[PDB]
Design a protein around this motif. Sequence first.
Motif, PDB file in Angstrom:
ATOM      1  N   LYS A  91      19.844  65.849 -76.762  1.00 37.10           N
ATOM      2  CA  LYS A  91      19.589  64.485 -76.309  1.00 37.10           C
ATOM      3  C   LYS A  91      18.863  63.669 -77.372  1.00 37.10           C
ATOM      4  O   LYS A  91      19.059  62.451 -77.467  1.00 37.10           O
ATOM      5  CB  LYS A  91      18.799  64.501 -75.001  1.00 37.10           C
ATOM      6  CG  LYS A  91      17.484  65.247 -75.070  1.00 37.10           C
ATOM      7  CD  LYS A  91      16.795  65.242 -73.717  1.00 37.10           C
ATOM      8  CE  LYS A  91      16.318  63.846 -73.351  1.00 37.10           C
ATOM      9  NZ  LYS A  91      15.541  63.839 -72.082  1.00 37.10           N
ATOM     10  N   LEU A  92      18.025  64.318 -78.181  1.00 41.25           N
ATOM     11  CA  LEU A  92      17.396  63.619 -79.297  1.00 41.25           C
ATOM     12  C   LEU A  92      18.444  63.116 -80.283  1.00 41.25           C
ATOM     13  O   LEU A  92      18.365  61.977 -80.764  1.00 41.25           O
ATOM     14  CB  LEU A  92      16.398  64.542 -79.993  1.00 41.25           C
ATOM     15  CG  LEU A  92      15.983  64.164 -81.414  1.00 41.25           C
ATOM     16  CD1 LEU A  92      15.132  62.908 -81.402  1.00 41.25           C
ATOM     17  CD2 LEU A  92      15.241  65.311 -82.076  1.00 41.25           C
ATOM     18  N   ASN A 114      22.852  56.667 -80.899  1.00 43.45           N
ATOM     19  CA  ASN A 114      22.961  55.368 -80.241  1.00 43.45           C
ATOM     20  C   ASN A 114      22.105  54.318 -80.940  1.00 43.45           C
ATOM     21  O   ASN A 114      22.545  53.177 -81.144  1.00 43.45           O
ATOM     22  CB  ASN A 114      22.565  55.490 -78.772  1.00 43.45           C
ATOM     23  CG  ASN A 114      23.417  56.490 -78.024  1.00 43.45           C
ATOM     24  OD1 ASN A 114      24.473  56.900 -78.501  1.00 43.45           O
ATOM     25  ND2 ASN A 114      22.959  56.891 -76.846  1.00 43.45           N
ATOM     26  N   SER A 115      20.877  54.685 -81.316  1.00 42.06           N
ATOM     27  CA  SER A 115      20.010  53.743 -82.014  1.00 42.06           C
ATOM     28  C   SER A 115      20.604  53.345 -83.358  1.00 42.06           C
ATOM     29  O   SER A 115      20.531  52.177 -83.755  1.00 42.06           O
ATOM     30  CB  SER A 115      18.619  54.345 -82.197  1.00 42.06           C
ATOM     31  OG  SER A 115      17.983  54.536 -80.946  1.00 42.06           O
ATOM     32  N   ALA A 116      21.198  54.304 -84.072  1.00 43.69           N
ATOM     33  CA  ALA A 116      21.827  53.993 -85.349  1.00 43.69           C
ATOM     34  C   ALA A 116      22.990  53.029 -85.168  1.00 43.69           C
ATOM     35  O   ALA A 116      23.152  52.090 -85.956  1.00 43.69           O
ATOM     36  CB  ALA A 116      22.292  55.277 -86.031  1.00 43.69           C
ATOM     37  N   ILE A 117      23.814  53.243 -84.139  1.00 48.83           N
ATOM     38  CA  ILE A 117      24.931  52.331 -83.898  1.00 48.83           C
ATOM     39  C   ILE A 117      24.419  50.929 -83.588  1.00 48.83           C
ATOM     40  O   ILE A 117      24.950  49.928 -84.093  1.00 48.83           O
ATOM     41  CB  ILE A 117      25.832  52.866 -82.772  1.00 48.83           C
ATOM     42  CG1 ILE A 117      26.680  54.032 -83.273  1.00 48.83           C
ATOM     43  CG2 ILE A 117      26.733  51.768 -82.241  1.00 48.83           C
ATOM     44  CD1 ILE A 117      27.550  54.634 -82.202  1.00 48.83           C
TER      45      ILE A 117
END
Lengths: 48, 48
Positions: free
Chosen positions: B2-3, B9-12
């Motif tokens: 999950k990390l 997701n944050s990078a996208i």
Amino acid sequence: KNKCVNFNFNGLKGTGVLTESNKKFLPFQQFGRDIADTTDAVRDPQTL
Amino acid sequence: QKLIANQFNSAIGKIQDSLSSTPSALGKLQDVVNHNAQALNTLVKQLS
């Protein structure tokens, strides 16, 4: 007007279609040129 | 697991926002178009 005609305006010869113009250049101005530096708008001698 | 999902997701999201906020990122493609346009314009000027 409104057909493919060979026109001769004051010795300026050409071939094309003459349409009524909504351009509003000032009364002293006579000819009208374009980006390619050719006359696309004209003013008739007999009737302005 | 999950990390890694959170990091992905944050990078996208960061890529989306940075791409939105930077106008010079897509210069290359833009540059291409400019060349052709400019070239064509130059050719027209050669008629004068």
